[PDB]
mmCIF file of N, CA, C and O in Angstrom:
data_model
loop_
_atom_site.group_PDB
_atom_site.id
_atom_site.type_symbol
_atom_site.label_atom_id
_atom_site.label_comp_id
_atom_site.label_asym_id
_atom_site.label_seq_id
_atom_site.Cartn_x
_atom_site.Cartn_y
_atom_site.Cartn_z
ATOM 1 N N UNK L 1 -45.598 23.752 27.775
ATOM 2 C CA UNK L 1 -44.188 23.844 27.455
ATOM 3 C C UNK L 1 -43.433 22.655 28.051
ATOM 4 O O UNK L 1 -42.208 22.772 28.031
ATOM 5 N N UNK L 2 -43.998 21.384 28.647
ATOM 6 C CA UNK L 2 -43.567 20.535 29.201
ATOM 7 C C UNK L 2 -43.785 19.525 28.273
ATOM 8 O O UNK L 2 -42.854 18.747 28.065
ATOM 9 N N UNK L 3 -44.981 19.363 27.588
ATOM 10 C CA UNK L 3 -45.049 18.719 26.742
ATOM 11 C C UNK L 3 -44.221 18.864 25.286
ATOM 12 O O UNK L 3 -43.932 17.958 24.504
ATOM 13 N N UNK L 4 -43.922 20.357 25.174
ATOM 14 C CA UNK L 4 -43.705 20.959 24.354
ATOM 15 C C UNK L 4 -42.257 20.652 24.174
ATOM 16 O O UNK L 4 -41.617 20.310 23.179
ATOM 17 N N UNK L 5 -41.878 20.895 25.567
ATOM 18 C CA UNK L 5 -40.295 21.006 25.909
ATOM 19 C C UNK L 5 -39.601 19.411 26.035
ATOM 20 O O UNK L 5 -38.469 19.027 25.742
ATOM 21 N N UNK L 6 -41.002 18.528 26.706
ATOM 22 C CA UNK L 6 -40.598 17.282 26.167
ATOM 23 C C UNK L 6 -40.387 16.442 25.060
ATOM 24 O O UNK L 6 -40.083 15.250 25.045
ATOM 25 N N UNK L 7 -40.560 17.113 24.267
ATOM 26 C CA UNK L 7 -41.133 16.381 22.295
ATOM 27 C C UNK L 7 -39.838 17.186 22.240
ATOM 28 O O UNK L 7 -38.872 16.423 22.238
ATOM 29 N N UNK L 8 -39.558 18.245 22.203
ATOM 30 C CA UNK L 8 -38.553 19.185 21.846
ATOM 31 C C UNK L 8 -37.379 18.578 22.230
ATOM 32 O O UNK L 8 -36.593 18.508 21.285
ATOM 33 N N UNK L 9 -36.948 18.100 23.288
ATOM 34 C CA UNK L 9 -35.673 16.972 23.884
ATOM 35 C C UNK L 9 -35.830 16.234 23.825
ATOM 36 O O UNK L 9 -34.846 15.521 24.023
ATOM 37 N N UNK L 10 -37.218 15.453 23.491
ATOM 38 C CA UNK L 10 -36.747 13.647 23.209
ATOM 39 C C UNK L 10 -36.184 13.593 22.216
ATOM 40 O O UNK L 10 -35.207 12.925 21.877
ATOM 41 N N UNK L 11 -37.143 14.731 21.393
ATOM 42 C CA UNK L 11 -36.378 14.591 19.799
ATOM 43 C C UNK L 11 -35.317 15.006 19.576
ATOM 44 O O UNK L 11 -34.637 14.728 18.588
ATOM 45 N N UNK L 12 -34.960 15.900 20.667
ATOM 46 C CA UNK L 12 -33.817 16.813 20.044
ATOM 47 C C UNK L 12 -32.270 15.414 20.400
ATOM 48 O O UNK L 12 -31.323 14.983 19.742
ATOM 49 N N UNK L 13 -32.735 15.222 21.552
ATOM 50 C CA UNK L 13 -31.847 13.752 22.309
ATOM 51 C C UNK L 13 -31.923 12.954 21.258
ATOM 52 O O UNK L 13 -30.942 12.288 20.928
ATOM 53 N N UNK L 14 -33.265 12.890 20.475
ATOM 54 C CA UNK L 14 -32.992 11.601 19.558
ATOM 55 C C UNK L 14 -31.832 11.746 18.877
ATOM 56 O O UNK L 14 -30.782 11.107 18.815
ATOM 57 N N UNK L 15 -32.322 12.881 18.304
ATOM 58 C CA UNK L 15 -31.163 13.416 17.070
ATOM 59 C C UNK L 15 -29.782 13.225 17.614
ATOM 60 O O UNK L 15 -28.863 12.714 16.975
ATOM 61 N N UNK L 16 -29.710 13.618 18.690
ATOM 62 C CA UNK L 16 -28.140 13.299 19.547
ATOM 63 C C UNK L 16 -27.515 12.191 19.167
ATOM 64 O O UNK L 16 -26.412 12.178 18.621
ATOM 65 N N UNK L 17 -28.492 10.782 19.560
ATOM 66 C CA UNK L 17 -28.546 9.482 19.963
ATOM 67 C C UNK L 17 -28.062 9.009 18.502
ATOM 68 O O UNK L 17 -27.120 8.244 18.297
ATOM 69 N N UNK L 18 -28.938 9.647 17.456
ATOM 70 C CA UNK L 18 -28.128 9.455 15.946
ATOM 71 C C UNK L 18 -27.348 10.002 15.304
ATOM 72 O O UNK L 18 -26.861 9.549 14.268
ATOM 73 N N UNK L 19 -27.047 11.270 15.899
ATOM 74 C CA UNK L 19 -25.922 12.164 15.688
ATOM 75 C C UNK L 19 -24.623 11.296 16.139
ATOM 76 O O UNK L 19 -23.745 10.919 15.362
ATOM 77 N N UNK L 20 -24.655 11.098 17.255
ATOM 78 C CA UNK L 20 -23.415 10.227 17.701
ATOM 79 C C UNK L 20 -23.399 8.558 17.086
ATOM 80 O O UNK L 20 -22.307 8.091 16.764
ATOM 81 N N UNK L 21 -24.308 7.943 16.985
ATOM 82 C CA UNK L 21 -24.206 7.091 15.621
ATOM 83 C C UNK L 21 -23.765 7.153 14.547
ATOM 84 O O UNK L 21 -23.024 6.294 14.069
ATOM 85 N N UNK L 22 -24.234 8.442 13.822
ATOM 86 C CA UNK L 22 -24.179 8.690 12.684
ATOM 87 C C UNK L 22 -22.397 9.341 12.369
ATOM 88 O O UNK L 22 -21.656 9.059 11.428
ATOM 89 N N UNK L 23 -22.187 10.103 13.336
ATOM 90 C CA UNK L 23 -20.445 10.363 13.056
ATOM 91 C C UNK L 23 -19.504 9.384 13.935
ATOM 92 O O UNK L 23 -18.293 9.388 14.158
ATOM 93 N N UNK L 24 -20.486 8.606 14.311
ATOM 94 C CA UNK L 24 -19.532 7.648 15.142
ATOM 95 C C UNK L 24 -19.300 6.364 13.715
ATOM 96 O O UNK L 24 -18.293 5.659 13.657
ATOM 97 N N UNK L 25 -19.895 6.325 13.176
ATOM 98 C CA UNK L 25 -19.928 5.016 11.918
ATOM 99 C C UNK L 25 -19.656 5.614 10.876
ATOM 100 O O UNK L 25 -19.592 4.836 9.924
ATOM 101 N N UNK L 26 -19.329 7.387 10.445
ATOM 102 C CA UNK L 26 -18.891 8.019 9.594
ATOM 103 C C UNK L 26 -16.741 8.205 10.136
ATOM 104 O O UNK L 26 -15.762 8.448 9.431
ATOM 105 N N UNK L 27 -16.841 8.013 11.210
ATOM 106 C CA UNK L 27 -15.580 7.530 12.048
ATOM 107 C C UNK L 27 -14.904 6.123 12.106
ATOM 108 O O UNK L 27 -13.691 5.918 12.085
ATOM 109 N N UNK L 28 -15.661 5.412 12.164
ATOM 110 C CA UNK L 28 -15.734 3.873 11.433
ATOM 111 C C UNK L 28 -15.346 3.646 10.344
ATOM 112 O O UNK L 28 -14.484 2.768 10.325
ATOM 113 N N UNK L 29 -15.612 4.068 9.375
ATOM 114 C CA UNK L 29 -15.126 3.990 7.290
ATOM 115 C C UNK L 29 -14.521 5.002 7.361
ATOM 116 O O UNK L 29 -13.837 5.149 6.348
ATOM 117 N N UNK L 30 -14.390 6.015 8.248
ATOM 118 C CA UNK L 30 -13.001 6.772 7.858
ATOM 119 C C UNK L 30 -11.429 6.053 8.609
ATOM 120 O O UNK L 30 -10.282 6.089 8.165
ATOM 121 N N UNK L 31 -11.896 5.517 9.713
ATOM 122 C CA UNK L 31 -11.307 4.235 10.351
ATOM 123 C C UNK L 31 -10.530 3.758 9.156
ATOM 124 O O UNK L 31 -9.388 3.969 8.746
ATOM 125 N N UNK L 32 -11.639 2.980 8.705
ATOM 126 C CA UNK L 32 -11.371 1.912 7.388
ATOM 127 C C UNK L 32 -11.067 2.233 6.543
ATOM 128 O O UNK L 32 -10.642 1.290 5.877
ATOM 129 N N UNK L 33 -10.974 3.509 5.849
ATOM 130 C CA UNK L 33 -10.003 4.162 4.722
ATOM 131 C C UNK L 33 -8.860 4.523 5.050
ATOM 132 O O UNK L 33 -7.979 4.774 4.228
ATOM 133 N N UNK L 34 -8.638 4.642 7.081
ATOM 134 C CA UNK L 34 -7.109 5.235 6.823
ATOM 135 C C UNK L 34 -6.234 3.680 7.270
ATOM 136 O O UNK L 34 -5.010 3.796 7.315
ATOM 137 N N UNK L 35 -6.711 2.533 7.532
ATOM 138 C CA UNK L 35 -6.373 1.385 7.605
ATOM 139 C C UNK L 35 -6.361 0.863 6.524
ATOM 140 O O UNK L 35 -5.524 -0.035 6.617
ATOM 141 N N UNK L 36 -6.888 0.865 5.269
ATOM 142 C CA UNK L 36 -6.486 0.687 3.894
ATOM 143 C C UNK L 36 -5.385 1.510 3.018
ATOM 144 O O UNK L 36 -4.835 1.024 2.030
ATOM 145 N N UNK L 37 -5.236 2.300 3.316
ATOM 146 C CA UNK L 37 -4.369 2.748 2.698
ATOM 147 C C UNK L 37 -2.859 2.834 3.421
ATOM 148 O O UNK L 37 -1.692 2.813 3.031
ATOM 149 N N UNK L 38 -3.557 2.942 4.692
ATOM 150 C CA UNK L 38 -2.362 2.540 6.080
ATOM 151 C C UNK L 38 -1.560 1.379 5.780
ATOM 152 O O UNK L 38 -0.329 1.346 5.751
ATOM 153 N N UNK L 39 -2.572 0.180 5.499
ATOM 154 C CA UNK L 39 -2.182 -1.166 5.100
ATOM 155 C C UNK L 39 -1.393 -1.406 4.024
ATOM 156 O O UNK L 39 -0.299 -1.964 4.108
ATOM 157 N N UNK L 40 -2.129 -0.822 2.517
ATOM 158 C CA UNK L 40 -1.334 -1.042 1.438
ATOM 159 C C UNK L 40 0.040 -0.390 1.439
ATOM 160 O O UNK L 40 1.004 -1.045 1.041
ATOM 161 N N UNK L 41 0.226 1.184 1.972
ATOM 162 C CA UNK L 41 1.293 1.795 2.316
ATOM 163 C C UNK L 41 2.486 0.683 2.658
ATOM 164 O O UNK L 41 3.472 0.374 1.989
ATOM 165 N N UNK L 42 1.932 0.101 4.216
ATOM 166 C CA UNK L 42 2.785 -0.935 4.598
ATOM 167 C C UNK L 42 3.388 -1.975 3.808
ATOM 168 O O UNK L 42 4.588 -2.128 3.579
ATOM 169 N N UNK L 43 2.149 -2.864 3.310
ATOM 170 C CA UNK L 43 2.554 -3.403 1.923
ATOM 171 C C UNK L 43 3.617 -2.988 0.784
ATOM 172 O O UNK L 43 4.392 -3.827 0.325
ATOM 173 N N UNK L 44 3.611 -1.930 0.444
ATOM 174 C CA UNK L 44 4.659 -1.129 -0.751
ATOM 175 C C UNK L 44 5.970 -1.223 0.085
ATOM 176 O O UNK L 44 7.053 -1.685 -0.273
ATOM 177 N N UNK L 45 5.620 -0.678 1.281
ATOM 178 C CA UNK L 45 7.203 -0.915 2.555
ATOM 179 C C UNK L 45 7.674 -2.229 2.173
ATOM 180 O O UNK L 45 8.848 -2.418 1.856
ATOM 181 N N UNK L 46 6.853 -3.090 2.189
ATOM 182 C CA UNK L 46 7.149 -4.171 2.342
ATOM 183 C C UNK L 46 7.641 -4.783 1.272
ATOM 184 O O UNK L 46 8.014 -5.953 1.352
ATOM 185 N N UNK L 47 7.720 -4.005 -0.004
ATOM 186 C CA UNK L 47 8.863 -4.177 -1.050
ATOM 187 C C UNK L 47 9.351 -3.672 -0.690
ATOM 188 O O UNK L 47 10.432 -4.251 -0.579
ATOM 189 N N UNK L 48 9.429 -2.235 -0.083
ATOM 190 C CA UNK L 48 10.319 -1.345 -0.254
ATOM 191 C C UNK L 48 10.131 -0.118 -0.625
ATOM 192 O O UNK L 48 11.108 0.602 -0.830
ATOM 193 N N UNK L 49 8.868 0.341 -0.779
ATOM 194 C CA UNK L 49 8.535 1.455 -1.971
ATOM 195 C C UNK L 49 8.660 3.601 -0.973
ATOM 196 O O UNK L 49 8.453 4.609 -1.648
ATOM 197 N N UNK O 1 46.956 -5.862 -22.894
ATOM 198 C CA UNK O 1 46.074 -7.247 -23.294
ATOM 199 C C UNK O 1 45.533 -8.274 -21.817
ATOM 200 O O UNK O 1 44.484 -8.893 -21.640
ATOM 201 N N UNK O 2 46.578 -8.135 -21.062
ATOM 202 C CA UNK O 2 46.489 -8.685 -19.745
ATOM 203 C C UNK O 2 45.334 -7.802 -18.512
ATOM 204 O O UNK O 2 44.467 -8.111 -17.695
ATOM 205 N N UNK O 3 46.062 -6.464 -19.079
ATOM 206 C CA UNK O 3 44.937 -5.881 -17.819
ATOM 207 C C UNK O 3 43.650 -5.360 -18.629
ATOM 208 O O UNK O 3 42.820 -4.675 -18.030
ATOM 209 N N UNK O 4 43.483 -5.668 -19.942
ATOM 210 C CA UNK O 4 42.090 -5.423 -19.881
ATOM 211 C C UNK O 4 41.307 -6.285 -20.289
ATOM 212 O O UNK O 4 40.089 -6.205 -20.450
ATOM 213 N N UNK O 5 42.317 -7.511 -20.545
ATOM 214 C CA UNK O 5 41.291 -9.039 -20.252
ATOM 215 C C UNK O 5 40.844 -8.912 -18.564
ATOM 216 O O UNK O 5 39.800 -8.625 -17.979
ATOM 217 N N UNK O 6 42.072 -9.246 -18.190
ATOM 218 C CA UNK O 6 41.334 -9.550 -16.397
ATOM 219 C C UNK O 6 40.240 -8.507 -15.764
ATOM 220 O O UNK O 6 39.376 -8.828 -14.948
ATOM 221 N N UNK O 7 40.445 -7.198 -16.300
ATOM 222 C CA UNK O 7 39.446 -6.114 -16.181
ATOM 223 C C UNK O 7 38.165 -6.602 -16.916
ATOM 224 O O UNK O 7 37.009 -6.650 -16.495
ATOM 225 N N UNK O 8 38.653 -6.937 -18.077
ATOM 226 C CA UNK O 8 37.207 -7.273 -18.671
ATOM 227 C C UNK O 8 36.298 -8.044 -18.458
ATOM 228 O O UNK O 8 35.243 -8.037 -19.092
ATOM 229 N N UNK O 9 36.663 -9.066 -17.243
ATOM 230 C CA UNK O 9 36.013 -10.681 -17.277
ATOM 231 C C UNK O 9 36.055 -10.100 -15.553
ATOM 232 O O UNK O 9 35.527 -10.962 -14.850
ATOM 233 N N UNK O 10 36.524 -8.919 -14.738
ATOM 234 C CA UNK O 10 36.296 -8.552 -13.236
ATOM 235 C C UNK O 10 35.134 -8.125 -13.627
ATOM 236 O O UNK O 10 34.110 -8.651 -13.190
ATOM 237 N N UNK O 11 35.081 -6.646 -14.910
ATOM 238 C CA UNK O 11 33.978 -6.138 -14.819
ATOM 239 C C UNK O 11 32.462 -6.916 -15.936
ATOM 240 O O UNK O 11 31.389 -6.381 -16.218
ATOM 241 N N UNK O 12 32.967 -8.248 -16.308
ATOM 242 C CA UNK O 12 32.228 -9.572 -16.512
ATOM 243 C C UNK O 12 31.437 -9.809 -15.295
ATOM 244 O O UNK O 12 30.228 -10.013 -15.193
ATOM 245 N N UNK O 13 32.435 -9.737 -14.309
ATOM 246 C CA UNK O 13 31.788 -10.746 -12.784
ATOM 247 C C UNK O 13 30.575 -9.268 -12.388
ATOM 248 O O UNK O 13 29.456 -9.304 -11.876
ATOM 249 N N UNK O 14 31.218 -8.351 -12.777
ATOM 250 C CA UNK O 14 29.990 -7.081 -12.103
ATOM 251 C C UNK O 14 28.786 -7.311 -12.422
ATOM 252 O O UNK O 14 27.802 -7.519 -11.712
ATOM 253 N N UNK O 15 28.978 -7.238 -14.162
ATOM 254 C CA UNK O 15 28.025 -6.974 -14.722
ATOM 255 C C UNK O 15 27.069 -7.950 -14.167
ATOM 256 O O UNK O 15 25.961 -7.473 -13.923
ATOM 257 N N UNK O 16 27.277 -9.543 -13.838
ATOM 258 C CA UNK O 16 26.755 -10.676 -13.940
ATOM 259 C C UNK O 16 26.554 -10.467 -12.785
ATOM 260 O O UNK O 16 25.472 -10.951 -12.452
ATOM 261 N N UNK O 17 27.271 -9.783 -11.671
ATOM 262 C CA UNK O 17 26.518 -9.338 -10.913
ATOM 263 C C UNK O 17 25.590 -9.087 -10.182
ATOM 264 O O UNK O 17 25.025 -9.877 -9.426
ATOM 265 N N UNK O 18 25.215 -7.276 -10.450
ATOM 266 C CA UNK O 18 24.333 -6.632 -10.337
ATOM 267 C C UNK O 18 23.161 -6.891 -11.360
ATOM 268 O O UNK O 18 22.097 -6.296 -11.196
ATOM 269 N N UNK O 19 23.388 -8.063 -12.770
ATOM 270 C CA UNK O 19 22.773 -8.384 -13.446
ATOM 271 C C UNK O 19 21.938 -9.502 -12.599
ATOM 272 O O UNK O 19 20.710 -9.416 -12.603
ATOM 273 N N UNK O 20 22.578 -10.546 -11.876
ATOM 274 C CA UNK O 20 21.665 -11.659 -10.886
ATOM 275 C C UNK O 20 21.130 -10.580 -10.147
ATOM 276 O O UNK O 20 19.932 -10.728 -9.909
ATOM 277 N N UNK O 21 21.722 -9.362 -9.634
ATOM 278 C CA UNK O 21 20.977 -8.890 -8.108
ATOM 279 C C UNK O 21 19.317 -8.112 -8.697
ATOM 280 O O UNK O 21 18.323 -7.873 -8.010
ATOM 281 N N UNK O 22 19.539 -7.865 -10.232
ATOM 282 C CA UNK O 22 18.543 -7.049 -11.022
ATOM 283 C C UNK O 22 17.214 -8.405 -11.064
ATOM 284 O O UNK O 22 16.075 -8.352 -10.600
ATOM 285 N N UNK O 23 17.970 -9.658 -11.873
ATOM 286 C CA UNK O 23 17.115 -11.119 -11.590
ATOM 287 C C UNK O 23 16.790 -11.528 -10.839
ATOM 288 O O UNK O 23 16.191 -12.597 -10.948
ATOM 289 N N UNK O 24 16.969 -10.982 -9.719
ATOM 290 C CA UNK O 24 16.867 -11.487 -8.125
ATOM 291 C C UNK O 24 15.341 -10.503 -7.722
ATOM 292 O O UNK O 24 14.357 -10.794 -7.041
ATOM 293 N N UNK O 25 15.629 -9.523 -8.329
ATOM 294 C CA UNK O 25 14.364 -8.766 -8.038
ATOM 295 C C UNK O 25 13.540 -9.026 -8.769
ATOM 296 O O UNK O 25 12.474 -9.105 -8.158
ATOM 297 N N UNK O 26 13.396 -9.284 -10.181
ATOM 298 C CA UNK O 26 12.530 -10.280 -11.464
ATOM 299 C C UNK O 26 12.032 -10.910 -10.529
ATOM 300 O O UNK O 26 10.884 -10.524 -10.308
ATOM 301 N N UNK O 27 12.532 -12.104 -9.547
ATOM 302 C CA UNK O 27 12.150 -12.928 -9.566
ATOM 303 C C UNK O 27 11.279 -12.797 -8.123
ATOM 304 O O UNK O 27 10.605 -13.744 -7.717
ATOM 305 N N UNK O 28 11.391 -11.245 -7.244
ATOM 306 C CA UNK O 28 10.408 -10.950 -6.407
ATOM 307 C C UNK O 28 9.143 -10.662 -6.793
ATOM 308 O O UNK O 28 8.066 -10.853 -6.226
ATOM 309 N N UNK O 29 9.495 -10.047 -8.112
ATOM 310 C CA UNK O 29 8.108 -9.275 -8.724
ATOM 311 C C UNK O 29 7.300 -10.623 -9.079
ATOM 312 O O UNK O 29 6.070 -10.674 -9.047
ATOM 313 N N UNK O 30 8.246 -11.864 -9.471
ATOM 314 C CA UNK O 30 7.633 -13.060 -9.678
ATOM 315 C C UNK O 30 6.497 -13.820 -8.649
ATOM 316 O O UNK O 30 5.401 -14.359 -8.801
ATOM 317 N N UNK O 31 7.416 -13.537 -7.519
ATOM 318 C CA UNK O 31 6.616 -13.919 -6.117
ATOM 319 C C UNK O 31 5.045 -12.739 -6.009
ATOM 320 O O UNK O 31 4.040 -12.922 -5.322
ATOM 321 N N UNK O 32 5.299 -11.766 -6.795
ATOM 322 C CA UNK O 32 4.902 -10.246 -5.953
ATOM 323 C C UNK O 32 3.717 -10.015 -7.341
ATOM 324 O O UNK O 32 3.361 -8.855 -7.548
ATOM 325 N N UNK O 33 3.169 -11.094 -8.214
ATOM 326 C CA UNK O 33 2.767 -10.817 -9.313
ATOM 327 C C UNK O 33 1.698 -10.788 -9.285
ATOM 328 O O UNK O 33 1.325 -10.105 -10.239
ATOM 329 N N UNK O 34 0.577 -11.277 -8.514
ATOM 330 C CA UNK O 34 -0.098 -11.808 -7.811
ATOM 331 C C UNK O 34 -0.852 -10.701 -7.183
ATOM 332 O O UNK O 34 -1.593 -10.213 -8.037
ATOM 333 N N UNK O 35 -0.970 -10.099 -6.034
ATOM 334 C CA UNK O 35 -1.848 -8.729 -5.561
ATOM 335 C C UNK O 35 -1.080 -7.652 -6.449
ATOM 336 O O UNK O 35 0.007 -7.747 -7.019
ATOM 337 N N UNK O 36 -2.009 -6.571 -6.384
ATOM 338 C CA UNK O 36 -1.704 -5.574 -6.731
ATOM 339 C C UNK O 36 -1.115 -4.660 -5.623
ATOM 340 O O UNK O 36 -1.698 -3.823 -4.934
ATOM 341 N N UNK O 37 0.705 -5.184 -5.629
ATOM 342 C CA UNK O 37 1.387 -4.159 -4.882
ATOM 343 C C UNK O 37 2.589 -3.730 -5.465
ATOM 344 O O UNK O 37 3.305 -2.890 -4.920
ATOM 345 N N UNK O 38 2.975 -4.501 -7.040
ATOM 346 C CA UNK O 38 4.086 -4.305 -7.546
ATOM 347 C C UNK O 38 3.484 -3.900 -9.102
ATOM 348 O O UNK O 38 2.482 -4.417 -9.597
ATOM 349 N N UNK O 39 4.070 -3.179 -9.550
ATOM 350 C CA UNK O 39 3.475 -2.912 -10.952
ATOM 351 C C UNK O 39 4.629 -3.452 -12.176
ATOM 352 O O UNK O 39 5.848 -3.441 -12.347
ATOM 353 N N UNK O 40 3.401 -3.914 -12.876
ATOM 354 C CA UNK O 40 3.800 -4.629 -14.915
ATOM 355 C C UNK O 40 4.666 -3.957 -15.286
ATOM 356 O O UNK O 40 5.660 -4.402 -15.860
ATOM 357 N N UNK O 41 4.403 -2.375 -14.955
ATOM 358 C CA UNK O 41 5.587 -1.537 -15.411
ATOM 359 C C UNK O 41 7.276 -1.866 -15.205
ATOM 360 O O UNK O 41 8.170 -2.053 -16.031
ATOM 361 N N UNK O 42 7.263 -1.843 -13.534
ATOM 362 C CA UNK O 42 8.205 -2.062 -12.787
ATOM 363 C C UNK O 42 9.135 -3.438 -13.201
ATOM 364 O O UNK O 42 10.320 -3.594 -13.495
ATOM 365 N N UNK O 43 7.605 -4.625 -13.023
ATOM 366 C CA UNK O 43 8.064 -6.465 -13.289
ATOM 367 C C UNK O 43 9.030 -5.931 -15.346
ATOM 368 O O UNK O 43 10.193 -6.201 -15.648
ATOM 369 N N UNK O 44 8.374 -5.465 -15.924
ATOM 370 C CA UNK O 44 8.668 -5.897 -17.506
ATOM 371 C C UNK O 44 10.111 -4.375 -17.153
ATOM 372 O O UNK O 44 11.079 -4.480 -17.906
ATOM 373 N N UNK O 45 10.145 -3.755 -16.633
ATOM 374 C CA UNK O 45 11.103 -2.413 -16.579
ATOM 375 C C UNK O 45 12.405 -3.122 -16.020
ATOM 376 O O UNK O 45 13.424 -2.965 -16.692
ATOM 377 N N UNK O 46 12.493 -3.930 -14.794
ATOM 378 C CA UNK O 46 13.358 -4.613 -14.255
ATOM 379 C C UNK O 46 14.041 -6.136 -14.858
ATOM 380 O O UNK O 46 15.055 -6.798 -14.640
ATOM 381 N N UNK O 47 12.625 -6.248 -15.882
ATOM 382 C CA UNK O 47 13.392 -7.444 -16.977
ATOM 383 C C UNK O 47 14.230 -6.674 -18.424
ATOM 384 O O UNK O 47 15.234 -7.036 -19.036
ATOM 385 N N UNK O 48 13.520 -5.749 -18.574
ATOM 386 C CA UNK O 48 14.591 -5.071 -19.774
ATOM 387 C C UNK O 48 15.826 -4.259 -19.412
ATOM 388 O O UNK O 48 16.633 -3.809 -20.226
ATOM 389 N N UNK O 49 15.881 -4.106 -17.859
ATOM 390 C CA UNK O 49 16.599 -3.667 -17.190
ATOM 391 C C UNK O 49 17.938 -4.665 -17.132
ATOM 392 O O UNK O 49 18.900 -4.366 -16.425
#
C-alpha cells in the first residue's frame, strides 16, 4: 500500500499538477475573452457607443 | 415678410448647423472606416441623415 499509495499520489498529484495547468490556461483565454471584448467595449466608448 | 425671412435664414444657420455637426460625424466614421468599430449602417445612416 506504499507502493500502491505511492502510484496512487504521484498520479493523483500529477493530475493536480495538470489540473492547475489545465484551469489555470482555461483562466488564461478566459482572461483573453474578457480583455477582448473588455477592449472592443472600450473602443465603441471611444466613439461613444 | 421680415420675421420670417430673418427666421428663415436663423433657422438656415441651424439647419447648416447641426447639418456640419451631422458632417462632422461623416467625417469620424471617415477616420473610423477602417477597423471594425463603427458600422456601414451607421457611416451611410449619418450621410442620409
Amino acid at each position: 500500500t506504499d507502493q500502491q499509495t505511492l502510484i496512487l499520489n504521484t498520479a493523483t498529484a500529477y493530475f493536480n499538477v495538470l489540473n492547475a495547468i489545465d484551469v489555470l490556461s482555461y483562466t488564461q483565454a478566459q482572461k483573453e475573452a474578457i480583455y477582448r471584448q473588455l477592449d472592443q467595449t472600450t473602443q465603441r466608448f471611444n466613439v461613444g457607443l | 415678410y421680415q420675421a420670417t425671412y430673418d427666421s428663415a435664414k436663423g433657422d438656415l444657420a441651424k439647419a447648416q448647423a447641426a447639418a456640419n455637426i451631422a458632417q462632422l460625424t461623416v467625417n469620424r466614421y471617415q477616420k473610423l472606416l477602417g477597423t471594425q468599430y463603427i458600422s456601414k449602417q451607421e457611416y451611410d445612416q449619418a450621410l442620409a441623415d
